[PDB]
Design a protein around this ligand. Structure first.
Ligand SMILES: [Zn+2]
Ligand SMILES: [Zn+2]
Length: 57
């Protein structure tokens, strides 16, 4: 078996799940308020993290 729990890359906590953004690209997580600059809109759809966007460019 495999158990997967997502934790924020910055604070390493898995609380505040609505605000813990999960990347569709790489499956890593980060809270809106743990990003800098802080994210002040909750994405309505899927999320791609800044590392994945930089690489895709
Ligand atoms: Zn965090
Ligand atoms: Zn990513």
């Amino acid at each position: 078996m495999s158990i997967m729990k997502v934790y924020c890359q910055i604070c390493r906590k898995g609380d505040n799940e609505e605000l813990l953004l999960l990347c569709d690209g790489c499956d890593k997580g980060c809270h809106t308020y743990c990003h800098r600059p802080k994210i002040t809109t909750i994405p309505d759809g899927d999320w791609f993290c800044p590392a994945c966007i930089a690489k895709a460019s």
